[PDB]
Design a protein around this ligand. Structure first.
Ligand SMILES: C[C@@H]1O[C@H](OP(=O)(O)O)[C@@H](O)[C@H](O)[C@@H]1O
Length: 361
């Protein structure tokens, strides 16, 4: 659809949007094009805050000048966009601002997606009221596998939706995020944005077809929030930088098995199935388990029910399901006394009961 961005905020106000990251428990890759277009995808994932905060944040502000100012705190970068030719220049070399550019474009600041036709960006945001100033914060080393890219895209889209009064619900935010992924030619799946924007634990399912709008079924969060099991979920930043159809059918069926185990509240089965998801991911691709990750895994595999890397991974973050709190203390001991990198450390993850949230000052 075409959008009509209208300044829905006061001139002395800032829109703050923020989203947790996402850990996929099972079914990942079945959401990734093109296999999702044949059998459909089943993905059990979950929204998590890191160290008690939503990691993916966006500030949107009115700007005195009649242009667009993109800033990045985690990279300390800045860029000025004043024409449609610059805004739609998504892969400007050296610009880490492809995501907010595409998001502003989808919000009606590009000629194709704006319902009202304008001639220049200056006139467009002069009728809009003033310029726009977007400041991003993604305090996560890239290549984490935590859905950072797509969830940050959804966060920018929701911040702009609140900033312009577009009245998008979370589902349409995720759908426009899929459109944005198609704009930047990332070819990415749809698991990440639904895992991050929507609160709690979810099973996501699609049918065959090019239209990939996932059906969402929430799961109880007992195995993640109850004090019996809460301290058994460990997330470890490792300091690492970065015929098949039968296997993907097996991955769909395994996502359904994980859904069953979570419904029934079986913690041991849940951990074993996380381990099986790790085995499936290793079977699918060669570069899933770099040698440093396996070196870490060998130190603590005897105290876990299962483990995996979030998303594509390739290193960085490692999710582990300890057998019990005593085993969790043992794992923290081992990985603190045998750090595979000086930057390796544990990250406290909590289930997000909020998902994407947005407020004003
Ligand atoms: C298993 C794979 O994980 C990716 O997540 P990231 O590693 O990019 O955070 C998703 O973008 C893919 O769609 C796929 O589900």
């Amino acid at each position: 659809r075409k959008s009509t961005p209208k300044l829905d905020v006061y001139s002395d106000q800032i829109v703050w949007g923020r989203s947790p990251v996402r850990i996929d428990m099972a079914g990942g890759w079945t959401d990734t094009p093109p296999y999702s277009l044949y059998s459909g995808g089943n993905v059990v994932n979950l929204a998590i805050e890191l160290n008690g905060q939503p990691p993916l944040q966006v500030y949107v502000k009115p700007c005195k000048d009649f242009h667009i100012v993109l800033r990045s705190i985690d990279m300390g970068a800045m860029e000025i966009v004043s024409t449609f030719d610059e805004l739609q220049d998504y892969k400007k070399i050296g610009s880490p601002f492809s995501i907010p550019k595409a998001a502003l474009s989808l919000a009606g600041f590009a000629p194709a997606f704006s319902a009202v036709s304008y001639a220049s960006l200056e006139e467009q945001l002069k009728d809009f009221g003033a310029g726009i100033e977007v400041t991003l914060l993604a305090a996560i080393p890239a290549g984490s596998g935590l859905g950072t890219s797509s969830i940050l895209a959804s966060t920018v889209l929701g911040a702009i939706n609140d900033f312009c009064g577009l009245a998008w619900d979370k589902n349409e935010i995720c759908q426009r995020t899929l459109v944005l992924e198609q704009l930047l030619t990332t070819g990415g799946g749809w698991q990440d944005q639904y895992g991050g924007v929507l609160q709690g634990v979810k099973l996501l399912q699609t049918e065959a077809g090019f239209a990939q709008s996932p059906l969402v079924r929430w799961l109880p969060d007992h195995l993640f929030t109850h004090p019996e099991y809460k301290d058994c979920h460990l997330l470890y930043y490792t300091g690492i930088t970065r015929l098949h159809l039968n296997l993907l059918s097996e991955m769909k069926a395994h996502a359904l098995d994980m859904n069953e185990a979570i419904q029934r509240g079986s913690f041991v089965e849940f951990g074993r199935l996380v381990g099986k998801t790790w085995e499936q991911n290793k079977a699918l691709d060669s570069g899933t388990n770099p040698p440093a990750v396996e070196a870490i895994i060998d130190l603590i595999k005897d105290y876990t029910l299962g483990y995996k890397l979030p998303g594509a991974g390739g290193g960085g973050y490692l999710y582990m399901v300890a057998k019990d709190p005593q085993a969790a203390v043992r794992i923290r001991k081992i990985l603190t006394e045998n750090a595979p990198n000086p930057r390796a450390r544990f990250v406290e993850m909590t289930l997000s009961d909020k998902g994407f949230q947005v407020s004003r000052s």
